[PDB]
Design a protein around this ligand. Structure first.
Ligand code: HEM
Length: 393
């Protein structure tokens, strides 16, 4: 009666595989309901009326934290997402390419034969880009990175460690008050930055006060950093295992986006999502009571043969793309950061190939560490360049 941890990936995948076949809806000893098949995960994620993103919904006198889009249900979710989206736009994201490329190239250019891909690229990159998108003083970047980094590091710890909430609040409370001051500053004296945009936005009579704007910016950072960090490490780890794709991608960089989707399917940085039932309901004929937590295994869905032929084959030739990418969610909460996630990882892989041709994982480098809670991937990924401009080759 145990959920296998995130680190031993094979044992995890083996267990999910058995669940999809023998117990596709399972109630754990904590009374959390686990959903393993793709069809059923999809059903849960579409049905927001039954499967709420708002645990406060089911509690007398409790209400959601304002600005926290991922914690609220339609109709208000729609109202808010519309406001937020008007600030954080497709051109906003796409104009970021040169800076992403510029930061990435510079960081890699200082990495030679041996290095940790996460320490060098995957960890610092996303947070640099979030800081710049938000428009915050270059002189605030170091502390901003330290707060985000601390919160990434928190996830290395056992999530049932009862000190969890306190250590989270120790970082979160200053972060958000820094952003909320920035919001108030920007409301009085706006610029060309996401915070300014967020405090300037109004869509259908609806705007964000400083509280909402600050909570959103914080959520945006938290959603954006670890996931993106984990994705790039997973990309390199997966090419390591299927290395003929290094050369295919080297030859044709147009192949990179399909590689990024296939890694996302193969190794979702978030293997699980959570909902709360609002009422007695059923999944796949299995009865689930009101007011309980349901965990949808995206990782199990991604490896479901009923949804993906030869699911355990790493195969970028799959006809992937768009809103079908379960690793960014499904339905109204579908990842707001998806274009940025996709952009950052496409540029990152392009740049890795450009400089190195190929990376191999140093699997016996003892600094290698996997996460084991919310995330499927690697905190430190020692690598070895196939080659680099540093060699008199
Ligand atoms: C590969 C990297 C990423 C992955 C795997 C990922 C994963 C996810 C998933 C699974 C969800 C849906 C959660 C739910 O339905 O409850 C989500 C939502 C969200 N993500 Fe991402 N994410 C990534 C990158 C980003 C980035 C870069 C940003 C910021 C630019 C971001 C911001 C958000 C926001 C604001 C939501 C909530 C959308 C809503 O509730 O309407 N994410 N993400």
């Amino acid at each position: 009666d145990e959920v296998p941890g995130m680190a031993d990936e094979t044992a995890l995948l083996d267990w999910l595989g058995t669940m999809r076949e023998k117990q596709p809806v399972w109630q754990d000893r904590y009374g959390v309901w686990h959903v393993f098949r793709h069809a059923d995960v999809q059903t849960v994620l579409r049905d927001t009326a039954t499967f709420s993103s708002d645990p406060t919904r089911v509690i007398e006198g409790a209400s959601p934290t304002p600005g926290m889009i991922h914690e609220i249900d339609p109709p208000e979710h729609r109202a808010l997402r519309k406001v937020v989206s008007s600030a954080f736009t497709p051109r906003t994201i796409s104009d970021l390419e040169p800076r992403i490329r510029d930061v990435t190239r510079s960081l890699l250019a200082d990495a030679g034969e041996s290095f940790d891909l996460v320490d060098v690229l995957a960890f610092p990159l996303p947070v640099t880009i979030v800081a710049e998108l938000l428009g915050l003083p270059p002189m605030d970047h170091e502390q901003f990175g330290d707060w985000s980094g601390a919160l990434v590091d928190i996830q290395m710890d056992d999530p049932t460690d009862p000190a969890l909430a306190e250590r989270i609040a120790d970082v979160l409370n200053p972060l958000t008050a820094y952003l909320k001051a920035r919001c108030a500053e920007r409301r009085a004296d706006p610029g060309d930055d996401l915070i300014s945009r967020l405090v300037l936005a109004e869509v259908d009579g609806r705007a964000l006060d400083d509280e909402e704007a600050a909570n959103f910016s914080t959520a945006l950072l938290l959603a954006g950093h670890i996931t993106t960090t984990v994705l790039l490490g997973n990309i390199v780890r997966t090419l390591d295992e299927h290395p003929a794709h290094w050369d295919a991608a080297a030859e044709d960089p147009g192949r990179i986006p399909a590689i990024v989707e296939e890694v996302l399917r193969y190794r979702p940085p978030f293997p699980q999502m959570q909902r709360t039932t609002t009422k007695a309901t059923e999944v796949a004929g299995v009865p689930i009571p009101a007011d309980v937590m349901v965990n949808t295994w995206v990782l199990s869905a991604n490896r479901d043969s009923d949804a993906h032929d030869d699911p355990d084959r790493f195969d970028p030739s799959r006809k992937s793309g768009g809103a079908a990418q379960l690793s960014f969610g499904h339905g109204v909460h579908f990842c707001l950061g998806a274009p940025l996630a996709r952009l950052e990882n496409r540029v990152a892989l392009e740049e890795i190939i450009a400089r190195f041709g190929r990376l191999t994982v140093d699997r016996d480098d003892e600094r290698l560490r996997h996460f084991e809670q919310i995330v499927l991937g690697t905190r430190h990924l020692p690598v070895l360049a196939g080659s680099s401009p540093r060699q008199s080759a």
